[PDB]
């Protein structure tokens, strides 16, 4: 198989660690959700092509601007993550995460991913956001942001229900192959 490297970026509250754990584990973590993700090499077959996809997380590196870029060398695909229950995490995408990724990973495809999509119809989420004059991120706000930053595409998933998780990693493999 060909070897490809994937790195997930985004704010601390974006759910990137949970997404990497749920995809890589095999059995859903019903007893304990790990605090951290080390690495993983996924065996993926997409559109007839076999790929070894190495997975990396940047969680913990958000406040260390000189340690963080060490995660970027030879990346083939970037997953740029935001949380649908956090419109503030979406607002940090165009002027913080996008310029850094375009600087250290020129010409590398970026997939903008809206995590925690299950919280779009959660009552506690909608009530808490209404207090700060906010609402869960709408699909069209996600698509317009992806379009604006020059993303390869826009995708949504729920690490909690597993919905959309397989499709994100299969699409990331196709992006890495182009």
């Amino acid at each position: 198989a060909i070897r490809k490297k994937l790195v997930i970026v985004g704010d601390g509250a974006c759910g990137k660690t949970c997404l990497l754990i749920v995809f890589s584990k095999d059995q859903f973590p019903e007893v304990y959700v790990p605090t951290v993700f080390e690495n993983y090499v996924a065996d993926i077959e997409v559109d007839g092509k076999q790929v070894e996809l190495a997975l990396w997380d940047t969680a913990g590196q958000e406040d260390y601007d000189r340690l963080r870029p060490l995660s970027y060398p030879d990346t083939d695909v970037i997953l740029m993550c935001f949380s649908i229950d956090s419109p503030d995490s979406l607002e940090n995408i165009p002027e913080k995460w996008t310029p850094e990724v375009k600087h250290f990973c020129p010409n590398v495809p970026i997939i903008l991913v809206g995590n925690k999509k299950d919280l779009r119809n959660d009552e506690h989420t909608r009530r808490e956001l209404a207090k700060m004059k906010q609402e869960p991120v709408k699909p069209e706000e996600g698509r317009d942001m992806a379009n604006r930053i020059g993303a390869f595409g826009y995708m949504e998933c729920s690490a909690k229900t597993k919905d959309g998780v397989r499709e994100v990693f299969e699409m990331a493999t196709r992006a890495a192959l182009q």
């Binding site: 007893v31 304990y32 605090t35 951290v36 190495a54 990396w56 340690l67």
Partner: protein, 244 residues
């Protein structure tokens, strides 16, 4: 890793590692705390094992089987002996704390109530100074190590066959040379995440809540110092490029 420690940390959590009749005697808050302490130790055991792959499989294998130029192996694995000493000592202390906490007649049932004091010792004084200087050195040499690896793999056929041979076993799937280097660099930024989550379930004893809060502040100070002390080295970099 050694079989004794691998079996002790084989389960996905503390709640699955201990006997269920022992688990049932504890409050849910204690189980939540112990689950995160177990993850800290399990990930430290895995980190020391990554360093042993680098020193004993890769480094020593290159010196004993290859005819590399002098100083090439050092460029590929900067500070690995110093890093292995720091983390093996820290791991020895974490495993002894667990061992001391075992119930008589059991090799699996334990509760660690005191961890903050051990984390303060590790992240203060001479041991903090040595971790800070070693990670400032290692992370400044990280890019050069990857470029040196790629240069040797593309130009040296013997080096290429050596790599294919020692990374072929399935247990090495996520532990190639470049993967080990990034695993080491990322280790230090895992500590505040693990310690903050242990702290969230350690409010029962005020002395312990205080020690974990102090330890968290010490780890963040160390990370900030390491971050400020980094300047990526480049093989063949000219003085003019550096002073501009």
């Amino acid at each position: 890793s050694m079989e004794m420690d691998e079996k002790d940390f084989a389960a996905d959590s503390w709640s699955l590692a201990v006997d269920s009749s022992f688990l049932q005697q504890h409050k849910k808050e204690v189980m939540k705390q112990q689950d995160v302490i177990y993850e800290l130790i399990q990930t430290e055991l895995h980190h020391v094992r990554t360093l042993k792959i680098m020193t004993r499989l890769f480094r020593t294998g290159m010196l004993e089987e290859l005819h590399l130029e002098p100083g090439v192996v050092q460029g590929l694995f900067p500070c690995v002996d110093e890093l292995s000493d720091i983390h093996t000592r820290f791991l020895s202390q974490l495993l002894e704390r667990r061992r001391q906490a075992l119930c008589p007649g059991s090799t699996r049932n334990f509760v660690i109530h005191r961890l903050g004091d051990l984390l303060i010792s590790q992240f203060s004084g001479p041991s903090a100074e040595q971790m800070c200087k070693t990670y400032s050195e290692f992370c400044s040499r990280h890019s050069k190590a990857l470029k040196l690896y790629k240069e040797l793999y593309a130009r040296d056929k013997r080096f290429q066959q050596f790599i294919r041979k020692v990374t072929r076993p399935a247990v090495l799937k996520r532990h190639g040379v470049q993967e080990c280097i990034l695993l080491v660099t990322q280790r230090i930024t895992k500590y505040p995440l693990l310690i903050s989550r242990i702290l969230q379930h350690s409010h029962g004893i005020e002395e312990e809540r205080q020690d974990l809060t102090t330890a968290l502040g010490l780890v963040k100070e160390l990370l900030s110092n390491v971050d400020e002390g980094i300047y990526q080295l480049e093989k063949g970099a000219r003085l003019q490029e550096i002073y501009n």
